[PDB]
Amino acid sequence: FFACYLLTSLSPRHKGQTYIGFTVNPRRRIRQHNGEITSGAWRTKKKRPWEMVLCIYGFPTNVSALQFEWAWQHPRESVAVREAAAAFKSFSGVASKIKLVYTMLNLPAWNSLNLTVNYFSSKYAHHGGKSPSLPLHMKVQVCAMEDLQYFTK
Ligand SMILES: [Ca+2]
């Protein structure tokens, strides 16, 4: 199981700030960012509580997921993403990070992969409706953390 994920902060001092990362265990990872586990969350610990908005999984290797993570975090450096990124009005906030990742899922670098977009709450799924449609073999679902965890094993 190799995933990239998106958080958003519910801290009033950082409200709406996002975090993008790579993980093999989303439940462990959100617990780390929120301090329920005391590892893995230097700096992000200060912006609690975080919500995990979504993750994308199905990458065939850790390396394939890490290539996607790096481009999502650095769309202006990525060869694959930069032309699409040159047309974006904003890179800030959940709405922009989701529009960007749906754009990425349509690029040749990733659009042949058998990927799933997992929203952890219906709260965020409408952003996908305002983003470019995904390649038709990809899956979009709303699945809470407690249910997806069994599929990560
Ligand atoms: Ca690692």
Numbering used by the authors: 27 to 179
Lines from the paper:
A nuclease belonging to the GIY-YIG superfamily has been identified from A. thaliana (At-HIGLE: HYL-1 Interacting GIY-YIG Like Endonuclease) (AT2G30350). At-HIGLE comprises an N-terminal GIY-YIG nuclease domain (amino acid residues 1–183) and an extended C-terminal region (amino acid residues 184-368). Here, we elucidated the crystal structure of the At-HIGLE nuclease domain from Arabidopsis thaliana, establishing it as a member of the SLX1-lineage of the GIY-YIG superfamily with structural changes in DNA interacting regions. Unlike fungal SLX1, At-HIGLE exists as a catalytically active homodimer capable of generating two coordinated nicks during HJ resolution.
Eventually, At-HIGLE was truncated (At-HIGLE1–183) based on secondary structure predictions to remove disordered segments at the C-terminal end. At-HIGLE1–183 crystallized in P212121 space group with one molecule in the asymmetric unit. Crystals diffracted to a resolution of 1.7 Å. The structure exhibits a mixed α/β topology. At-HIGLE1–183 comprises of a β sheet formed by five β strands oriented as β2–β1–β3–β4–β5 with β2 and β3 strands present in anti-parallel orientations with respect to β1, β4 and β5 strands. Poor electron densities did not allow the modeling of amino acids 1–26 at the N-terminal end and 180–183 at the C-terminal end. At-HIGLE1–183 superimposes with the nuclease domain of Cg-SLX1 with a root-mean square deviation (r.m.s.d.) of 0.8 Å. Compared to the nuclease domain of Cg-Slx1, At-HIGLE1–183 showed differences in the conformation of loops relevant to DNA substrate binding. In summary, At-HIGLE exists in a conformation ready for interactions with DNA substrate. Catalytically essential amino acid residues are Glu95, Arg55, Tyr31 and Tyr45.
